[PDB]
Amino acid sequence: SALHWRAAGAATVLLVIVLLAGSYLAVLAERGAPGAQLITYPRALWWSVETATTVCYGDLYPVTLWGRCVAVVVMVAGITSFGLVTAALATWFVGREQERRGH
Amino acid sequence: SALHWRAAGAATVLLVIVLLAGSYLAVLAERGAPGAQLITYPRALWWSVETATTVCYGDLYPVTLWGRCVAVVVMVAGITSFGLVTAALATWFVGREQERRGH
Amino acid sequence: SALHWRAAGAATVLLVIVLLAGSYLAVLAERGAPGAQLITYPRALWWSVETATTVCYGDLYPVTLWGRCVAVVVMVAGITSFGLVTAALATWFVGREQERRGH
Amino acid sequence: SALHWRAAGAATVLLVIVLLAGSYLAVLAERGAPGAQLITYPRALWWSVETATTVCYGDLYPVTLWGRCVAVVVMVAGITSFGLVTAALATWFVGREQERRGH
Amino acid sequence: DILLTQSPAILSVSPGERVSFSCRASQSIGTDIHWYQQRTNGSPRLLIKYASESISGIPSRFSGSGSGTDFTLSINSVESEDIANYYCQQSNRWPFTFGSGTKLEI
Amino acid sequence: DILLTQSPAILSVSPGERVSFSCRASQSIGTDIHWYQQRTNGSPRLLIKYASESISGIPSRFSGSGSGTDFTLSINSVESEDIANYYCQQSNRWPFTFGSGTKLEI
Numbered sequence: 001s002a003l004h005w006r007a008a009g010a011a012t013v014l015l016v017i018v019l020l021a022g023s024y025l026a027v028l029a030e031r032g033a034p035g036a037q038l039i040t041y042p043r044a045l046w047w048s049v050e051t052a053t054t055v056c057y058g059d060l061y062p063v064t065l066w067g068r069c070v071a072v073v074v075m076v077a078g079i080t081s082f083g084l085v086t087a088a089l090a091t092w093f094v095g096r097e098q099e100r101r102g103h
Numbered sequence: 104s105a106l107h108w109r110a111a112g113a114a115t116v117l118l119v120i121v122l123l124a125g126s127y128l129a130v131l132a133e134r135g136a137p138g139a140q141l142i143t144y145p146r147a148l149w150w151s152v153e154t155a156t157t158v159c160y161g162d163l164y165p166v167t168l169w170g171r172c173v174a175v176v177v178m179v180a181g182i183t184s185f186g187l188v189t190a191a192l193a194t195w196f197v198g199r200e201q202e203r204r205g206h
Numbered sequence: 207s208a209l210h211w212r213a214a215g216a217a218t219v220l221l222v223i224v225l226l227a228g229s230y231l232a233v234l235a236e237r238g239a240p241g242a243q244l245i246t247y248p249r250a251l252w253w254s255v256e257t258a259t260t261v262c263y264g265d266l267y268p269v270t271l272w273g274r275c276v277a278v279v280v281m282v283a284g285i286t287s288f289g290l291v292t293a294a295l296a297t298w299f300v301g302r303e304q305e306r307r308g309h
Numbered sequence: 310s311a312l313h314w315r316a317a318g319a320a321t322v323l324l325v326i327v328l329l330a331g332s333y334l335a336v337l338a339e340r341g342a343p344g345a346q347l348i349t350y351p352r353a354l355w356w357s358v359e360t361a362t363t364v365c366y367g368d369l370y371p372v373t374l375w376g377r378c379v380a381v382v383v384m385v386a387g388i389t390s391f392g393l394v395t396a397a398l399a400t401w402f403v404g405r406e407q408e409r410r411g412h
Numbered sequence: 413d414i415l416l417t418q419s420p421a422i423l424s425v426s427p428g429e430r431v432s433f434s435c436r437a438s439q440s441i442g443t444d445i446h447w448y449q450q451r452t453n454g455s456p457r458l459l460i461k462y463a464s465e466s467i468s469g470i471p472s473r474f475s476g477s478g479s480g481t482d483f484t485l486s487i488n489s490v491e492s493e494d495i496a497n498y499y500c501q502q503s504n505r506w507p508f509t510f511g512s513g514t515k516l517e518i
Numbered sequence: 519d520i521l522l523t524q525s526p527a528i529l530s531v532s533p534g535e536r537v538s539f540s541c542r543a544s545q546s547i548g549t550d551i552h553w554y555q556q557r558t559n560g561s562p563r564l565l566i567k568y569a570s571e572s573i574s575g576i577p578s579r580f581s582g583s584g585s586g587t588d589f590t591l592s593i594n595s596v597e598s599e600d601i602a603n604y605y606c607q608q609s610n611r612w613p614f615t616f617g618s619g620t621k622l623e624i
């Protein structure tokens with residue numbers, strides 16, 4: 001029932017959806033473009049994971065306007081989802097410490 | 104009225120401003136420099152987004168002193184704005200949990 | 207006794223374990239693969255550190271399915287462990303400020 | 310007087326010190342090594358900034374054991390300092406919201 | 413600084429033929445190549461931007477292709493008004509540089 | 519280790535002419551090239567740092583250019599005191615290396 005945990009879970013499922021949609025749409029956006037490397041779905045999912053975690057190796061990246069806009073959506077969704085998990089951990093710790101000191 | 108949400112919104116608009124100014128100033132700083140690649144505004148905005156999110160592919164980066172100082176401003180503004188969003192999420196969760204347990 | 211500090215310490219030891227296991231398993235996963243560079247244990251530990259911190263230089267990265275799955279585990283463990291440390295710092299600050307204002 | 314703000318300020322000055330020491334020590338560690346690029350102090354400070362923010366372009370990185378250990382210190386100091394700033398922002402927001410609702 | 417090699421320096425074709433101009437960059441520059449046409453006593457005129465993108469008011473027989481180091485400007489069915497010098501130009505790295513030019517003869 | 523090729527090894531020019539020395543690196547090194555002049559029986563003297571930046575007290579006719587693998591030291595209007603050996607030096611990668619030198623003759 002606690003809001004922070006349900007929001008964390010929601011953010012997790014939303015992130016999975018964004019990774020899958022970003023993989024699909026990045027391929028869709030990049031295949032028009034000579035030299036583009038983000039053009040098959042298995043490595044595009046890998047790219048979407050590294051973009052969502054900000055763990056970005058430089059092995060793949062978009063070169064088109066629409067692929068970069070897809071990238072921005074994946075970045076913000078990833079950073080926001082992990083920040084939400086952090087915030088829920090803090091809420092849990094704060095509650096448990098209020099209990100441990102009897103408040 | 105709540106401080107955390109207004110600070111989050113302020114940080115968002117400030118970040119947009121910093122991305123635009125950083126794009127402009129990075130081009131201004133880098134065109135003096137042989138070999139520089141951060142020299143047209145569309146890709147400089149892309150570079151400023153990846154710098155602000157720390158999702159940094161390695162496709163573009165500054166090579167001059169002043170371009171790197173611009174980069175540092177964009178990095179800190181990005182990290183601070185997303186950290187502020189995290190902090191506001193935590194404040195919201197903490198308040199809602201204080202309510203859910205009736206305090 | 208405080209939950210946040212014990213969870214931080216647990217997360218630290220778990221992260222060390224994940225870095226070591228990820229180094230071992232990344233080598234195991236990548237040596238099948240022509241062109242793979244993540245194939246000796248000293249640099250694989252370095253790679254696992256950069257993956258866990260999201261400080262990712264692009265000097266090494268996995269090219270196989272199973273090496274990338276190992277990578278994802280290391281990314282999430284790193285981001286979660288550092289987020290947990292942040293959350294514990296916030297719980298400590300929140301408690302100390304409740305004291306400083308006498309609540 | 311508030312603990313979170315003083316800890317944030319301390320972390321800022323400590324981070325500046327770590328960036329300067331990491332620049333010096335990274336050059337010291339890497340000049341032994343054929344092919345190393347992290348070998349003059351101006352770009353080593355740039356490298357230390359990108360390592361501390363996790364905004365890591367791939368233009369420079371250490372290749373030696375001791376340069377990589379220096380790198381790890383800079384990574385952890387950066388991530389910890391920014392996480393501490395986040396935690397202080399959350400403590401400020403939580404206090405202000407406790408006031409705004411009259412507690 | 414990026415050398416752009418345009419060879420051959422003169423291309424001779426018959427009316428109605430398809431012709432192809434070559435531009436080779438000394439290092440990889442994505443699709444940051446632009447093509448200009450300059451007629452006798454005229455100023456240069458942009459034909460193709462970013463290796464393949466059309467410009468408004470340019471006849472559709474003009475097209476461009478390539479990426480990396482190798483670039484081609486093509487004309488479908490050459491005609492007389494196409495007699496000109498043709499230059500490529502890179503914007504990938506500072507400073508911008510020009511190819512040395514290919515003359516079109518009919 | 520980065521080979522720096524200075525060819526030709528001797529350059530012969532007439533007074534007042536503009537002269538250009540060439541330095542080619544075996545791999546790309548940004549602008550981390552520095553030029554030194556050494557006269558007969560003298561010690562080397564820095565002329566140009568980071569491929570193009572001026573040094574205080576060096577006559578303004580000296581300039582430098584290039585980036586990547588190709589570098590040029592230029593002298594506007596050569597004069598007699600410019601008779602010397604000229605070396606390039608890279609600082610992009612350990613160890614620092616020197617070109618083999620170009621002698622200037624008038």
Ligand SMILES: CCCCCCCCCCCCCC(=O)O[C@@H](CO)COC(=O)CCCCCCCC
Pocket residue numbers: 020021023024041042043045046049269270271274275278
């Ligand atoms: C609707 C559009 C599809 C959107 C998602 C597409 C998913 C593609 C299936 C992924 C497995 C491919 C099977 C295979 O053998 O892949 C290997 C190819 O031989 C290499 O795998 C790979 O190298 C990339 C896989 C990385 C997975 C990252 C884990 C994310 C939590």
Ligand SMILES: CCCCCCCCCCCCCC(=O)O[C@@H](CO)COC(=O)CCCCCCCC
Pocket residue numbers: 063064065068069072123124126127144145146148149152462
């Ligand atoms: C005052 C100085 C200007 C500062 C900002 C400049 C903005 C430039 C306009 C951006 C769109 C360019 C139009 C176009 O067709 O761009 C394509 C070029 O063909 C490729 O676009 C690109 O590849 C880069 C765009 C990436 C956008 C990232 C989204 C940020 C939230």
Ligand SMILES: CCCCCCCCCCCCCC(=O)O[C@@H](CO)COC(=O)CCCCCCCC
Pocket residue numbers: 226227229230247248249251252255372373374377378381
């Ligand atoms: C069970 C599988 C093993 C899993 C872990 C393997 C650990 C390997 C030992 C690491 C030291 C190697 C000794 C040596 O001289 O390494 C140098 C080689 O000459 C270069 O070191 C290196 O370049 C990489 C070391 C980076 C360490 C990062 C610090 C992490 C907190």
Ligand SMILES: CCCCCCCCCCCCCC(=O)O[C@@H](CO)COC(=O)CCCCCCCC
Pocket residue numbers: 166167168171172175329330332333350351352354355358568
């Ligand atoms: C004790 C060991 C020293 C440790 C610190 C060394 C500091 C070096 C001075 C930095 C300025 C160099 C002057 C200069 O003209 O630098 C340019 C060279 O022409 C390029 O600058 C550069 O490209 C790198 C500078 C990046 C600065 C990042 C900002 C950090 C908040």
Ligand SMILES: CCCCCCCCCO
Pocket residue numbers: 025028029066067069070073
């Ligand atoms: C949310 C981003 C929209 C994805 C656009 C698909 C690419 C169309 C390219 O013509």
Ligand SMILES: CCCCCCCCCO
Pocket residue numbers: 128131132169170172173176
């Ligand atoms: C805040 C950074 C200032 C930007 C400086 C512009 C570049 C001037 C280069 O001569």
Ligand SMILES: CCCCCCCCCO
Pocket residue numbers: 231234235272273275276279
């Ligand atoms: C948790 C990831 C499992 C590691 C798989 C090892 C690689 C086996 C490759 O055949």
Ligand SMILES: CCCCCCCCCO
Pocket residue numbers: 334337338375376378379382
């Ligand atoms: C904290 C890291 C110690 C730095 C070690 C200096 C490098 C010595 C290389 O022989």
Ligand SMILES: [K+]
Pocket residue numbers: 053054055056156157158159259260261262362363364365
């Ligand atoms: K990062």
Ligand SMILES: [K+]
Pocket residue numbers: 055056057058158159160161261262263264364365366367
């Ligand atoms: K990176």
Ligand SMILES: [K+]
Pocket residue numbers: 057058160161263264366367
């Ligand atoms: K790279």
Ligand SMILES: [K+]
Pocket residue numbers: none
């Ligand atoms: K973070």
